[PDB]
Design an enzyme around this catalytic site. Structure first.
Site, mmCIF file in Angstrom:
data_model
loop_
_atom_site.group_PDB
_atom_site.id
_atom_site.type_symbol
_atom_site.label_atom_id
_atom_site.label_comp_id
_atom_site.label_asym_id
_atom_site.label_seq_id
_atom_site.Cartn_x
_atom_site.Cartn_y
_atom_site.Cartn_z
ATOM 1 N N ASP A 25 -9.936 -4.496 -1.609
ATOM 2 C CA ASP A 25 -9.650 -3.132 -2.065
ATOM 3 C C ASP A 25 -10.327 -2.842 -3.390
ATOM 4 O O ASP A 25 -9.774 -3.170 -4.463
ATOM 5 C CB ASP A 25 -8.138 -2.961 -2.212
ATOM 6 C CG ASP A 25 -7.693 -1.536 -2.499
ATOM 7 O OD1 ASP A 25 -8.584 -0.701 -2.758
ATOM 8 O OD2 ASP A 25 -6.478 -1.325 -2.481
ATOM 9 N N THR A 26 -11.532 -2.268 -3.314
ATOM 10 C CA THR A 26 -12.221 -1.990 -4.580
ATOM 11 C C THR A 26 -11.536 -0.886 -5.377
ATOM 12 O O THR A 26 -11.898 -0.782 -6.563
ATOM 13 C CB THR A 26 -13.698 -1.629 -4.312
ATOM 14 O OG1 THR A 26 -13.744 -0.510 -3.410
ATOM 15 C CG2 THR A 26 -14.415 -2.789 -3.603
ATOM 16 N N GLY A 27 -10.638 -0.123 -4.763
ATOM 17 C CA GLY A 27 -9.871 0.896 -5.452
ATOM 18 C C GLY A 27 -8.731 0.374 -6.298
ATOM 19 O O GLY A 27 -8.156 1.044 -7.140
HETATM 20 C C1 AB2 Z 1 -5.482 7.821 5.301
HETATM 21 O O1 AB2 Z 1 -6.197 7.217 4.258
HETATM 22 C C2 AB2 Z 1 -5.809 6.757 3.013
HETATM 23 C C3 AB2 Z 1 -6.736 6.670 1.879
HETATM 24 C C4 AB2 Z 1 -6.240 6.158 0.627
HETATM 25 C C5 AB2 Z 1 -4.897 5.732 0.508
HETATM 26 S S1 AB2 Z 1 -4.339 4.801 -0.931
HETATM 27 O O2 AB2 Z 1 -2.955 4.733 -0.882
HETATM 28 O O3 AB2 Z 1 -4.783 5.562 -2.035
HETATM 29 N N1 AB2 Z 1 -4.990 3.205 -0.755
HETATM 30 C C6 AB2 Z 1 -4.672 2.169 0.237
HETATM 31 C C7 AB2 Z 1 -4.414 0.687 -0.036
HETATM 32 C C8 AB2 Z 1 -3.559 -0.010 1.027
HETATM 33 C C9 AB2 Z 1 -5.774 -0.007 -0.132
HETATM 34 C C10 AB2 Z 1 -6.134 2.923 -1.598
HETATM 35 C C11 AB2 Z 1 -6.205 2.316 -2.908
HETATM 36 O O4 AB2 Z 1 -7.373 1.739 -3.391
HETATM 37 C C12 AB2 Z 1 -5.077 2.848 -3.853
HETATM 38 C C13 AB2 Z 1 -6.119 3.529 -4.835
HETATM 39 C C14 AB2 Z 1 -5.295 4.563 -5.640
HETATM 40 C C15 AB2 Z 1 -4.665 4.127 -6.853
HETATM 41 C C16 AB2 Z 1 -3.928 5.077 -7.642
HETATM 42 C C17 AB2 Z 1 -3.804 6.395 -7.109
HETATM 43 C C18 AB2 Z 1 -4.408 6.837 -5.893
HETATM 44 C C19 AB2 Z 1 -5.190 5.901 -5.123
HETATM 45 N N2 AB2 Z 1 -4.210 1.898 -4.595
HETATM 46 C C20 AB2 Z 1 -4.483 0.853 -5.431
HETATM 47 C C21 AB2 Z 1 -3.275 0.330 -5.821
HETATM 48 C C22 AB2 Z 1 -3.008 -0.836 -6.778
HETATM 49 O O5 AB2 Z 1 -3.322 -0.676 -8.166
HETATM 50 C C23 AB2 Z 1 -2.529 0.129 -9.053
HETATM 51 O O6 AB2 Z 1 -1.593 0.852 -8.841
HETATM 52 N N3 AB2 Z 1 -3.427 0.577 -9.854
HETATM 53 C C24 AB2 Z 1 -3.374 1.311 -11.048
HETATM 54 C C25 AB2 Z 1 -4.602 2.147 -10.628
HETATM 55 C C26 AB2 Z 1 -5.661 1.866 -9.673
HETATM 56 C C27 AB2 Z 1 -6.566 2.882 -9.241
HETATM 57 C C28 AB2 Z 1 -6.358 4.234 -9.685
HETATM 58 C C29 AB2 Z 1 -5.263 4.514 -10.606
HETATM 59 C C30 AB2 Z 1 -4.388 3.492 -11.065
HETATM 60 C C31 AB2 Z 1 -2.912 3.555 -11.489
HETATM 61 C C32 AB2 Z 1 -2.807 2.184 -12.148
HETATM 62 O O7 AB2 Z 1 -1.596 1.855 -12.840
HETATM 63 N N4 AB2 Z 1 -2.329 1.094 -5.227
HETATM 64 N N5 AB2 Z 1 -2.872 1.965 -4.481
HETATM 65 C C33 AB2 Z 1 -3.986 5.873 1.636
HETATM 66 C C34 AB2 Z 1 -4.450 6.354 2.896
#
Ligand code: AB2
Ligand code: BR
Ligand code: BR
Ligand code: BR
Ligand code: BR
Ligand code: BR
Ligand code: BR
Ligand code: BR
Ligand code: BR
Ligand code: BR
Ligand code: BR
Ligand code: BR
Ligand code: BR
Lengths: 99, 99
Positions: A25-27
């Site tokens: 998960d590069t996100g």
């Molecule tokens: C139908 O398609 C979809 C596309 C995206 C998503 S997602 O929920 O956004 N997701 C899926 C996951 C199982 C891989 C992607 C993902 O990379 C999200 C990225 C994200 C993060 C924050 C807001 C929106 C989207 N992701 C990553 C994480 C874990 O890391 C942290 O929470 N990260 C922090 C962080 C990381 C990136 C961006 C902002 C921030 C807030 C920080 O405190 N949780 N979700 C869901 C369905």
């Protein structure tokens, strides 16, 4: 390996004495796993995503091995609907994006 | 190009006649952007992220460009804390993971 994105980028991740499957998960800044046994002490952390924030258990100095590549770093445990390997460990195995 | 992950893999996307920065997000199935204008009609969709489910607006057949690389696909608009480019568009530009 060279991994395409037509399907989720699932890999096998060696952690603790067990295998788990997780998404590359590069996100994700950090690596977050569903409930599992990890040794040692933990500290609290809040992290946020789509949907909002969650509290997790932060375990530091955890060894991991992904597809034959070893690394060490922090692993977060908490109610994620998916095991995800985040950039903190992807950098250590040399993982890049390319196009 | 080759993008490493010591920092967020941010890249600019041209869409709707505008430039936006977004995260290349290999854990995202779908592309989700913060509120903006897009032409045409939209349909409802519910997606799930680490911290629950959110409602988004689904726009189909939206042209997009990323590092010169052109594609078209579905773009979701909703309350995401970060603009994310998901696999539905990343495959179209030939983006892979490598290590
Ligand atoms: C139908 O398609 C979809 C596309 C995206 C998503 S997602 O929920 O956004 N997701 C899926 C996951 C199982 C891989 C992607 C993902 O990379 C999200 C990225 C994200 C993060 C924050 C807001 C929106 C989207 N992701 C990553 C994480 C874990 O890391 C942290 O929470 N990260 C922090 C962080 C990381 C990136 C961006 C902002 C921030 C807030 C920080 O405190 N949780 N979700 C869901 C369905
Ligand atoms: Br929580
Ligand atoms: Br770390
Ligand atoms: Br999921
Ligand atoms: Br490097
Ligand atoms: Br960053
Ligand atoms: Br612009
Ligand atoms: Br922007
Ligand atoms: Br979803
Ligand atoms: Br699509
Ligand atoms: Br299309
Ligand atoms: Br291509
Ligand atoms: Br291909």
């Amino acid at each position: 390996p060279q991994i395409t994105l037509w399907k989720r980028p699932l890999v096998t991740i060696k952690i603790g004495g067990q295998l788990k499957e997780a998404l590359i998960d590069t996100g994700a800044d950090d690596t977050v796993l569903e409930e599992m046994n990890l040794p040692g002490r933990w500290k609290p952390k809040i992290i946020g995503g789509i949907g909002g924030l969650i509290k997790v258990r932060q375990y530091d100095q955890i060894p991991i091995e992904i597809c034959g590549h070893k690394a060490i770093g922090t692993v977060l445990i908490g109610p994620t609907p998916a095991n995800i390997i985040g950039r903190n460990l992807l950098t250590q195995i040399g993982c890049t994006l390319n196009f």
